[PDB]
Amino acid sequence: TKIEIKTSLGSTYHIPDARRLSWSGDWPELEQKQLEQLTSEMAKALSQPDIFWFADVTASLKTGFCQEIFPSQKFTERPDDHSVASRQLATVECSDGQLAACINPQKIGAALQKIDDWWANDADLPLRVHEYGANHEALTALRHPATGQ
Amino acid sequence: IFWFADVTASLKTGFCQEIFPSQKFTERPDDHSVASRQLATVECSDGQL
Amino acid sequence: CHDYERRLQSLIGQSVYFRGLAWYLGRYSLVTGKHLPEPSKSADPKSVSAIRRPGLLDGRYCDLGMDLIIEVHIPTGGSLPFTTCLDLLRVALPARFAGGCLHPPSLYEEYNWCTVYQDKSTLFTVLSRLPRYGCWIYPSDADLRSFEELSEALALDRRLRPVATGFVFLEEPVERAGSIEGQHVYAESAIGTALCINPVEMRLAGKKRFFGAGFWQLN
RNA sequence: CCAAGAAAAGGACUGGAAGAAAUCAUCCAAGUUGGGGACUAUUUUCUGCCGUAUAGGCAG
C-alpha cells in the first residue's frame, strides 16, 4: 500500500509502504520525519484562524487476481418483493454519468478520530472519541457515568 | 477408465454438390429481410465461420 | 449568502454588502436510504452499561454541483481590488450548505474559482459559454392561491417548478423563554414557484434581461 | 446569522439433472458522356589537370 498527500501550502508527503506503521512504536527514518512535518501544518490549522488549508489524499492498493472489495453499505428496510437486494452497497455518480463504489464521509471520519487511549490509565487500543466512552466491539461503555470519568 | 474416441470420415463428392448442415429453430418472420431458413455454424479461433 | 458576508466583514475593515444572489444547476443526484443516529442516549440513567439509539427519521438527500454569482457592493469611495482580498474571500467561505458539506474544486486541477468582475459585458460573455445540459433558476410571475391552481399551471408549462420560499408569521414577535437570541415568533412554511431556464435561452435573451431578471433578493 | 448544532448497518452462503426443426420451391425483357488547352519561368552546377579511358582521382 502506498500513500500520497498534497496540500494547499505546496508540501507533498509520501509513504513508500504503509503496511507496517503501528500506533505504538517508532517509525523508520524518512517516515518519522514526515510525520513531524505534517504535524506542524495541522497543529496550526486546528488553532489559528484565517489560514485556508485543504488537503488531497490518494493511495494505491496492489491486489490479487480477482480480489473482493468492501465499500460502504446502505441502511435499508427489508423488501417485501423478493426481487430487490437485501444487501445494497453505496456508489457515487461520476462526472460522466456512470456510478462507482465509494466509502461514505462519516465512515472515513470515524476512522480519523480514533485516538483515545487515555482511559483507565491503560492504553490498550484507542477508542473513537465519545462522551461516554462507547465500545462498539464489546457493546459497552468505558466512561460510564457511575465512574466519574 | 478415461476412454476417448476420435472419429473422422471422408466423403468423396460431386463437382459442386450441396451440403446439409443443421438448421436453426426459428419463428415466422415478417420483416421480409431475414432468411426463412437459417443454418448452424461455428466460429474458429481466427474469426472464420 | 449572509453567513459568508459576516465572515468577510470580520476580515476587511471596509463595509461590504450583498444586494442579490444567483443560482445555477450543473449536476443533481438523488441518494436513497437514511442516516443511522449516534448512540447518544443511555438505556437507563443509572446502574446500566447499555447504550440505546435515540430514534429513526425518514428524509431525502442529494448531491449537488453548482455555481453562484453574487452582486457585491462596497460603500466606501476607495475600494480594495487586491490579491489580499481574494485570499480573504477564500477564507470567509463557509463549510456548511443546506445541511450538507461544501467543498471547493479538487486541488490537483485547481484554476481561479473565485474571480471578480466590474463589467457586465465581460461577465455575460463568459456565462453564455456554459454547457447546454445545465439549468438557470429564475423567479416566476404567476400568483397561485391553491394546489388546484398549481396543478393547472404545471400542466400548461414545462419550465415551472414549486419551491420553498420562506415563512408566514402566525403572531407578532414577542419575548419568550427558551429563545436563542432576542424575540421569538411562530410561522408556517410558504410554498411558491420558480422557472428552470436553459443556457440556450439566455444566449438569445441578451445581457439586459439576464441582469434584470436573473438575480434573487429578500423582500 | 443555510427546517439551526453532533451520528460506523455489520456479520455467514453450493441451482442442478435430460433433448432431432424438416420437407419443397425459374428475375426477366431494351437501353449513344462530350466538346477546348504552353510547366518555365531572373535561372546558380562555369574553367583547367593526372590518366590507354564518357573508368577513377585533384586544383580554381
Place this chain on the structure above:
DNA sequence: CCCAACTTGGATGATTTCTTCCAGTCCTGGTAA
C-alpha cells in the same frame, strides 16, 4: 462549368410452448399507574 437520374408484375403452408423444492434474524417507543 453543363445537362440530365427509370415502369411492371409480384413478399408463404404444418403442429407442438414442461417439471421440483426451498423464501433467515438482530439491535434500534412515550406514556401512564
Place this chain on the structure above:
DNA sequence: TTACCTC
C-alpha cells in the same frame, strides 16, 4: 417498579 397500541 409494571404494561398499552396504528391499515
